[PDB]
Design a protein around this nucleic acid. Structure first.
Length: 249
RNA sequence: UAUGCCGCCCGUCUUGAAACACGGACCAAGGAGUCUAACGUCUAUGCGAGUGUUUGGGUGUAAAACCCAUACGCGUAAUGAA
RNA sequence: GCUGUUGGGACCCGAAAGAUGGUGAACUAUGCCUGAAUAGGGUGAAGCCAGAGGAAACUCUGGUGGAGGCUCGUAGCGGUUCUGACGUGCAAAUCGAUCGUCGAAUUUGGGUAUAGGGGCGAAAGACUAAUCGAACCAUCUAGUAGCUGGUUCCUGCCGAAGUU
RNA sequence: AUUUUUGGUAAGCAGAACUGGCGAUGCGGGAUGAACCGAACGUAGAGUUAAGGUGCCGGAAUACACGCUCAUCAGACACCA
RNA sequence: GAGUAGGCAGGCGUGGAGGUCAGUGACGAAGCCUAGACCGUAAGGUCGGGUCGAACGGCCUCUAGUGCAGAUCUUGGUGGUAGUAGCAAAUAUUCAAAUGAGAACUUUGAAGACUGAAGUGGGGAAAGGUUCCACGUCAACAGCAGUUGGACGUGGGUUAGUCGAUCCUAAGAGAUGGGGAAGCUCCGUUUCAAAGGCCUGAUUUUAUGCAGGCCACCAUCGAAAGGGAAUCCGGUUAAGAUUCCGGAACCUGGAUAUGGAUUCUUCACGGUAACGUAACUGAAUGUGGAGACGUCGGCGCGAGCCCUGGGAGGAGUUAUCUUUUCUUCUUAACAGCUUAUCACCCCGGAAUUGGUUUAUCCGGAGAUGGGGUCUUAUGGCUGGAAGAGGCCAGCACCUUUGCUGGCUCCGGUGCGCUUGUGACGGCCCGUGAAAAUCCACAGGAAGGAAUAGUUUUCAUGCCAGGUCGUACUGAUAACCGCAGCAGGUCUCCAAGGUGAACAGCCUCUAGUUGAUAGAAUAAUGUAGAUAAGGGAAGUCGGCAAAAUAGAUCCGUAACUUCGGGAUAAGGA
RNA sequence: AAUUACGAUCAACUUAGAACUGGUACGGACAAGGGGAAUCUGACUGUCUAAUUAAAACAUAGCAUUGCGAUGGUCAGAAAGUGAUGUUGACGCAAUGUGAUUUCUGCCCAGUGCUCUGAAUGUCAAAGUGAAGAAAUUCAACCAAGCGCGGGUAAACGGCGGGAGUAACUAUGACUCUCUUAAGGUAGCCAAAUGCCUCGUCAUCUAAUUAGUGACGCGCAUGAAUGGAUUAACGAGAUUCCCACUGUCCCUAUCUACUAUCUAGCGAAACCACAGCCAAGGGAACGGGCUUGGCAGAAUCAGCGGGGAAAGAAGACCCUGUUGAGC
RNA sequence: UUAUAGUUUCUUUACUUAUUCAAUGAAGCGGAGCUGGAAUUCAUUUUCCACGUUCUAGCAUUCAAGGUCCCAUUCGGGGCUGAUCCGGGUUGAAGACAUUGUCAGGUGGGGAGUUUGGCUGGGGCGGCACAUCUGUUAAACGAUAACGCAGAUGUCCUAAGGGGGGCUCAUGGAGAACAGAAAUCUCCAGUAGAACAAAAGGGUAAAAGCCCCCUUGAUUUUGAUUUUCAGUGUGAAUACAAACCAUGAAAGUGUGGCCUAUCGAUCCUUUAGUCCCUCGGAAUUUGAGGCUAGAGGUGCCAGAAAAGUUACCACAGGGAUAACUGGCUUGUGGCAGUCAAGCGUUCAUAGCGACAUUGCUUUUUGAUUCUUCGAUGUCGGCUCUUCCUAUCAUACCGAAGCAGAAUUCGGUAAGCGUUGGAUUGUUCACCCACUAAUAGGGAACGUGAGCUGGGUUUAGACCGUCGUGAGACAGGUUAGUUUUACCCUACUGAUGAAUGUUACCGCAAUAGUAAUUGAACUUAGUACGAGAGGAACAGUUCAUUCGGAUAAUUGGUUUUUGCGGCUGUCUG
């Protein structure tokens, strides 16, 4: 049998990200002395689009404390952030929308975003459109704060891990229907080559573990094991359950 | 050449080919049981309880011919797993 | 020395295959980069302007505008039917009429990436240089064949088997 | 293929027994035919016959003898139509 | 005395080998040809005749790549079919002369035609590679012909500071440090690297040591369509020209001396202001701009073309008519002075809400109104530049060249066509490259005066611009398809009429008139057509064809996701 | 200074309106929709079998499910100081299914599969542990994961036909039992592209209909995202009927051009054992040749498609082969 | 008992330094000290308590201030602060876990390799005719086949083996309380009609059977022999011999079952035997290996280790073998007789016909496998010719339960014709309608270089059922390339040398041949008939189907491009 679409996506020839039209790596400015001990003021110089990503990027000009420059940094604009407004990044920075303070230096119940998994990561969590973390709990004894992720999972991050206050802008983007194929086409054309997906069942048995038959049908269980080899996984990997539930998910 | 009578197209597989079975338009040339190691039978030749010079040496008119020691193979004893 | 046996290309010619190591994206497939190309019409979306009606709630009219993976149709791109032409052709896929579509999921040049149990696939086992249910080149290789075909002078004598 | 013989409606079908043939076989005859009849074959001459025939084709009695048959679908040589 | 498969024996023939016949042979070896002969049951042998020209044989033995009709055998050659099939799509040729041995095909003239500016026009890209052009020539090729040719023979021809390449980066490809791998080499291109360059004077030790000091996540390749320093006109050759010549520019790199401008504390002044003027210091470093960008719909402007008027020339028609049919009347880069949407500035203080677009946006973060500032795209005029080019007339000139003079002017118009563009607007879960390169500012390092010095962002002046490509076709004959193949192959420019129109049909410019021809008009074909009456009865099936059709007015159903259906239908 | 709705001038083509006129002609050539009533099916535009299939197949938006919070998920690499996603972060990435909108999406974890805040020891490898021995060694308990056992799960694969009798009356909706493991096909739909019988039966369309449509349903073998029932618009899709139209036909005819034909020139190929008259006979059971008859006269031209079991290609169907390949 | 600190022995934590994951251009880490403002126990040697920037889209870069030495006080350049000291651990996670290495268990069609019996009236589905046994086939020795017939085996038995001894079995008859058809008892007959483990056959009467007594010949050693047969194996059997036993008074009999079936190689493993041999430098004991006889098994039974699928398919072959024709056959189908119980008022036969029975045909379907697998183009229709007659109509006849008309049954007879449509691809079928009638057939199931391509049967696709699945379906559905004649013959037409030349006019061998059917008027409302209905020959007039001509007329055709008209454009 052939190597499946799924299998040869990871070889990464044509399936690589379309990265010409993008502004750059959206990160928080590196964890440094000024952010540890005080905070730096930055100016939201412009708020720009980014291709394959449905959340505006806030290009915010900071200074260089050590040499005479203006180190420009590319953020993911929180909703209500505007042009020329002052962003404040550090431990001592005030609790306003746009500001970058460590989760330890923040009260409980805050709606934070662009959070770090490790301290000095420069943003990992709640980075997509209309998504945010809720800082549930705390503990200064073994300084590690409890947080609730957009997936609804509770994690425990260090107190020195930073995050930007408010929700990430561009929310409700998914609640409009994409519409007539071409909208999807154009959406995908600037992220990746993962579009118009052929159904394994509609292929020949060479091409997919679903192929063949005188009727289109999977034939055996679509719930595949976790221990299934890299090449065997087509359907639902390590499916705890299946089917449409009644009442609440 | 005429005349009387006779005479299906060869090769092939086949129980059975003139075959409505296969190859063949025609011609020239090329074109298919070989050599080798090891053996069975039968026969010729030598020597014959022996036999085999030629791996090697000596020699040479020089890949020839001629000469030759010690082994070695086989035979001269079989039967037993031993 | 004839005959015979076995291993060797083993009387000669013949597979579909398999293995090793290499060469192809000048065709077509998909993505990316950087370019280019597409008359004239129909219908008349939002936004906008002026009217009329009614106690009010609110409802009707005319114009404007110029939307649409809208629509007719040219170039273009395609290939439905004629099961037309041709079918030892113009051509190893063309010709003519008829037709699909024609501002986008469009058409396309150059550059660049993906190489064979691999690619690529809006999925037909499709396409990957007229080659694809596993490309092409060389080698292993004179592959093997209980199977087909062939197997070259004369005369003389003898003369079978299809059964255990 | 005659004879014995199983299956089968049957078969130029399938399968046996003994023998003889074709295969591997020309020749005379049954018009023609692998198998039937007669005979098996160096090259010739002469003579005589086999099976089969002797109106004409066609070598050979339109021979002899006793009967039968007249068909507007005569009949005519075994295997064999 | 038969005989397949098969066995065995006796011989026939071939290439070589040892021996022998003191073999044959240029007075003719071998080979081949022979309705001549003889021997042999046969395989075969022997002889005569011819052709030919250099070797060959009998016999006794040795040895083998040793004997052919078949293998859809191999290679090479040859046939019958057969002077047959055929050489029939791109509308089409015809008369005369010339040339020549020879003309349907060549050259010229004259007709008649076609392509019809989405072309059979004029350039190019990739590809080819001399096909370009001249002379000589026709054995081969151009499926007829050939005097012709993209053929054949010998030559000639491609001129660059400005066009490209060269440079920059794009998707990417790739050394390096390193790490993997038995190894071929694989990963990665900023990484767990000690990863060199920049300028000022110095100080004049036949020119070498300083420091003002700075600055550093770092090869290279990658576009003849992206980014990009700078060229235009006229003429010129058999064939080249944005290159040659003539005239005029411009750019970059470097040198420098005058003119200017600035300078009594020196780095200019003016305007309230937007900003202006010929200049009018400016290191490190930092900052910002340009390079730098979608697509579409209408709208304004510009250039070119199209239509069109008067006048100055020439040509065509003229039995009749026509103040008319045709045609020339053109202005490059570059330099100047000027020229505008937009934006901005001052005065002013708006509701009785005004200004205003085709499109409804704008105004107390200051409208309207009055007056100003700028971008110079774009136009105007001028210089270029009339001497050029064009259209003429008169005069000669043996050749080959001329000489002389004249006109080259003034309009108008637009939902026109192409095209550049400016300000807007619709669209997006799509918001539509980067780098080289260049500039500007912030900044204030350093330097600099008046009886002599500053400044090269301005004016003039001086010098240099290498290397490679450059001809030609770009296709119904130059590229790929075995070929001079009805196929395929990327673009640019684009006239008149009809008409909505770049549709179809006809013409102008320019280009071809090439596709074997002549005769005759049977069958059957192929591509076009028409048919009385009936009207799907044909047929698997209304396949094929017929009918309908543009525009204007009238009218428009079920159903509906309320957008449609819709050009419904049905009429005039 | 006395104070209106007005002149001069130049200039395109748009639509109205009337008259006149013709062999009722006028988008005069060119150009240029046939339309209507239904069913099946896919919502639509889009895409592919270059060279026999353009479709109802693929895609699609919508819907649903599954995995994953990075010391990760899916995937790559012989390896690695290696890589894709990822210049990414759940409104994301990855993996499936169904296929617009409307309406709904039932029941079944017994089986296969997947998963787990589930329980022991039922196994339970190597290394380790202990016993015996002179050692090699044999024997024992301890034994990780997974299996096994227990739960969860069907928009996971799938299944859901269930099957009998009694009873008003004349065909039975009340009783009764046993369930194929778990449930017994629910709402719906149909002789449907799924119905064998089948040309089902009834109606309708026709003079006549194995066709069409609408109903009926113990449905050989319909059915709920292996989606079921609708469904406007769309379709070079499959099908039926009607009107217009016609050489499709009754029934053929005629015309044009280019062929064919003849000529000059140039000039192939396929195929070919030898060849080329029949009838019967026998025969590898369908002869050009054989036997017996019929017969039979040079050279041939244009047609033709009866024959040459004509040509094209070592049947691709079927079998065999101790021959392979994709799956 | 613990009080030595002499190892992890096992489990609960901790340390950084290996290993590990990040990030920065390795800037600010850690500890302490200042200033805190303060903690109040109280101004401290006590321990809790921060360390310069926030309304605003500006700016922040070349060490300035004080202080100290040099510059002889020119020029400025330098020390420390400004900005706290010390440790040089860049920062932070993670940590002896993970990572990696090796080995081990699980999972692993993602992937690789390979397999997927045989016989066979084609394969497959069945079956076992594949190893065996009885009877029959089997043709009186033996041997003998088929998917021939009726059956059987993969076991069972310490007694159902061995010996000996007593008795007689099936069944019937007559009889004895309960007791009867059947419980037990007695006698009489009783050639086996019983019994002997099974299948069947053979065998057996003081036994081989049934009852009783004792045993283990169902033992040891190896050889020869018979059947199958190669005179191999295996199995079974026979007869002795040499040992040891059993029984019996003994003769004797006994090496498993009364006889004919009941079973299995090498290699491997395991057991029995034997003071055995070997382990090769020499000893011993384990251990292993040998020697002789068993057992664990191959049922495909002389003994591979083995699942599908292909409608995407492939190669070598095969007419040894299927799907079509043809050939023998004729069951089956179709047609036709003989006999005649009877049906038909009566009446066998006008017309039919039971029970039987003899055929003929090759338009069905089978049976077979002879031809073809280096292909004979595989259904139906369209077209077209010819033939068969088993006659639907027509011609002329005979018969009748024939009055007429109508119909039925036959004869000669294939001359003559035998249709138009709806649905279906269909052949077949079924309806409507006209006709004189709408008979049946053949000719490679006529006819594809004649067409068509609906069906069938390649590849795409959908549904149902089946399959875990790939896939399957002679189930349904839709889309799906139909090639070549120019050769010979045949056929149709067209020439033609030679009969001294040429011309005209003829004859006729042979071959062909063609006409067809209906209606209407009259006969005639006549015959016939109770009536109702209702003929026929003769005499006319027209039609259908066919054929051969012909073009006056009618219609069609138009390149007569004959005339006229009309549009677009070009020729002023």
């Amino acid at each position: 049998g052939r190597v499946i679409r799924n299998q040869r996506k990871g070889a990464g020839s044509i399936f690589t990200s379309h990265t010409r039209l993008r502004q750059g790596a959206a990160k928080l400015r590196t964890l440094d002395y000024a952010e540890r001990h005080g905070y730096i003021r930055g100016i939201v110089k412009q708020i720009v689009h980014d291709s394959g990503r449905g959340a505006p990027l806030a290009k915010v000009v900071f200074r260089d404390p050590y040499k005479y420059r203006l180190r420009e940094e590319i953020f993911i604009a929180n909703e209500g952030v505007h042009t020329g407004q002052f962003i404040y990044a550090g431990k001592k920075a005030s609790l306003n929308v746009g500001n970058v303070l460590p989760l330890g230096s923040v009260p409980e119940g805050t709606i934070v975003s662009n959070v770090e998994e490790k301290p000095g990561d420069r943003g990992a969590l709640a980075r997509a459109s209309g998504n945010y973390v809720i800082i549930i709990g705390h503990n200064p004894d073994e300084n590690k704060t409890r947080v609730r992720l957009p997936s609804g999972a509770k994690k425990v991050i260090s107190s020195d891990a930073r995050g930007v206050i408010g929700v990430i802008a561009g929310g409700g983007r998914v609640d409009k229907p994409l519409l007539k194929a071409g909208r999807a086409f154009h959406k995908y054309r600037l992220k990746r080559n993962s579009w118009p997906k052929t159904r394994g069942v509609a292929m020949n048995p060479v091409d997919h573990p679903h192929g063949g038959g005188n009727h289109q049908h999977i034939g055996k269980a679509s719930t595949i094991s976790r221990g299934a080899v890299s090449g065997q996984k087509a359907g639902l990997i390590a499916a705890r359950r299946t089917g449409l539930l009644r009442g609440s998910q």
